[PDB]
Structure formats: structure tokens, C-alpha cells
Amino acid sequence: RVSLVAVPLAYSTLPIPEFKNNPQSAIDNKYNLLVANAINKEPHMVPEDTVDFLKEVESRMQHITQG
Amino acid sequence: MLCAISGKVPRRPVLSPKSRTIFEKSLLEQYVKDTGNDPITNEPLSIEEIVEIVPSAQQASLTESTNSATLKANYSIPNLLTSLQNEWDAIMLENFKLRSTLDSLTKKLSTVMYERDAAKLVAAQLLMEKNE
Amino acid sequence: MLCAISGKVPRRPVLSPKSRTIFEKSLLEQYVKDTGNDPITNEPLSIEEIVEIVPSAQQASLTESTNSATLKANYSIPNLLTSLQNEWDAIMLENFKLRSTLDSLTKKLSTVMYERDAAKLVAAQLLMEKNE
């Protein structure tokens, strides 16, 4: 059993953006999936492990943006 | 000196002691009564803390005589009403421009925020798939 | 104008000089005859001091020659002007808040764009390390 957790999109106060018509990358597919979930009001479910990998990715991004 | 809210020359100038800034009395009193804060510093401000600036007699005579001398050429009620309408239109154009820009920027921001979260998710998933 | 005791339009209006307030003559006179005090300030008041207001016969004759159109017109130029001023004040406050918001939103958008690009860089790096 992989427990799924809902990632809270912080953008509840912002208008849902349009779909990308040409999703050339995994990121763009993920973006379209988030947009579809927001349109449907469905939460974006991820494995519980992914939340910890998200925290590590955020730590790497911080080091990048400090330049 | 201009009111920090209206950008016009005030008729009853007041100073906020927090921001040390000049405002029109009515505007500042309304903003404080709504928010309880100074509109610039956002520090808490009361209506009693507002300092009403006393105009010197030369300032009173200048405000009356600038109004008088320049309205004198178009002082007829019909010209006054026409000027009022044109000024309202100018204000409404500015408000519309502001609102339109805010809406466009909000849509763009929403897009970019979705892109950022999508990228964070894809990064975390690649990190998982690499650590398996 | 309303009587401060009854909250109704008085049939014989009087002014108390102490409270500077309108009352019904009978109510005020009786109150004084019983208590010797003004009903709002509780200051001593005498019946001789009460200034009875005369409803001017001119008032009636002036409401005659005010056209029925102008009495049916549920507008007064003072009230229209004050409504326009309250609108102007509100729109000035709105435009101020719009500008402040738009600035904050621009700064936020720039920040989010930097975060997006940092996420994309981390993702691309993990992908490259996964393919090698």
C-alpha cells in the first residue's frame, strides 16, 4: 500500500491558468495535469515519499536562487 | 505638496505621524477607519493621532485665488458641469487601465505559479526514480 | 428635524439653549416643570429660557413655489454633490490600493519566475544524471 497525500496548491486565490497546447516536456505535462485537477477541483495526489523528495528539491532550488 | 492617495493638491491637508506624509483629510480618515493602519507604512494609526495642518493665511488666499483666477475663465455652471464629467471620465479611464493591468498580471502570475509547482513535482519524482 | 425625546417630527418645535437640541414643546416644558433640568445635558433649565421655534409662514410659501417637480425630485444638489464626493473619495482609495497591489504583484511575479527557473534547472540536472 502506497499512501497518497494531496499536495496543497497554494494558488487557491488565483485564477486557473490555461492548458499548454504543446507540452514539450515532463514539466509541461505535470503543469497540464495540475491545471486539469484545478479545473475539476480534484486534489493532486502524490505518494507520501514524494513529499520528502519535494523538500529536498526545494532545498536545492534555494541554493540556486541565492546567486 | 500633493496628497499621497489622490495625487492632487489637498483642501484640508493632514499629516500622518507614522508615515510623516501629507494626505487629504477625508481620504486618510476613511482609510484609517477602514483598515486601522497608515496607508504607506501599514503601521497602526488612529484618527486622533492625525495632525491637521493649519494653512497660513497666505496659503488660504493662494488656494482661493488659484481656484478663483483659473475657474474665472470657465466659471459658468455649464462649463463646471462639463469639466466635472471630463474629469470623471479621466479617472474612470485610469481605474480601468489599473484594473486591466492587475487582471492580466494575475493571470500571468497564476500561470507561472502552476509552472513552478509542476517543475518542483517533476524534480521530486526524478529524484525518487534515481534513488530507487 | 426630529424631537430628541420622541424621535418624531415635532408639532410645536422648541430649542433648548443648553443642549442646542430640538424638542416637542409639551414634552420639554413638562420635563422642565417636573425636573428643572435639560433632558440631554441635565443642566438646569428654566421655561423662560426655552426658545420656541416658529415654523415660518414663509417656509410654507417657499414650499409652494418650489415646483412639485423639485419636491418630488428625491434629490438635493447638496446631497448629489456629497454623493459624488463620496464616490470620488472611494475611487481615489481604490486607485491607490490598485497601484499598491499591482506593485506587490509585479515583485511577486518576478520572484515566482526565479523559483520556476530554479526548479527547472534542478529537474534538468536530475534528468541528465539519470540518463548518464
Rounded Cα distance, C24 and C8, in Å:
9
Contact B50, B13 (CB under 8 A): no
Q: Name the closest residue on chain C to residue B127, using Cα atoms.
A: C126
Sign of the Cα torsion B100, B102, B104, B110 reads negative
Please give the residue of chain C at the shortest CA–CA distance from B89. Answer: C88
With both helix axes pointing from N to C terminus, report the angle between C77-131 and B77-131 in degrees, rounded to the nearest 10.
20
- Chain B residues lying within 8 Å of C129, measured CB to CB: 130
Residues in B lying within 8 Å of A, measured between beta carbons: 106-107, 109-111, 113-115, 117-125, 127-128, 131
CA C29 to CA C35: how far, in whole Å? 10
Chain B residues near residue C107 by CB distance under 8 angstroms? none
Q: Are strands A44-47 and C13-16 parallel, antiparallel or unpaired?
A: unpaired
Contacts of B127 in chain C (CB under 8 A): 126
Contact, A50 vs A39, CB < 8 A?
Answer: no
Of the candidates A26, A31, A61, the beta carbon closest to that of B114 is on A31
CA atoms within 13 A on the CB side of B131: 11
CB distance C112 to B114 below 8 Å? no
Q: How many CB atoms lie within 10 A of CB A41?
A: 7
Method: cryo-EM
**DSSP 3-state assignment of B2?**
coil
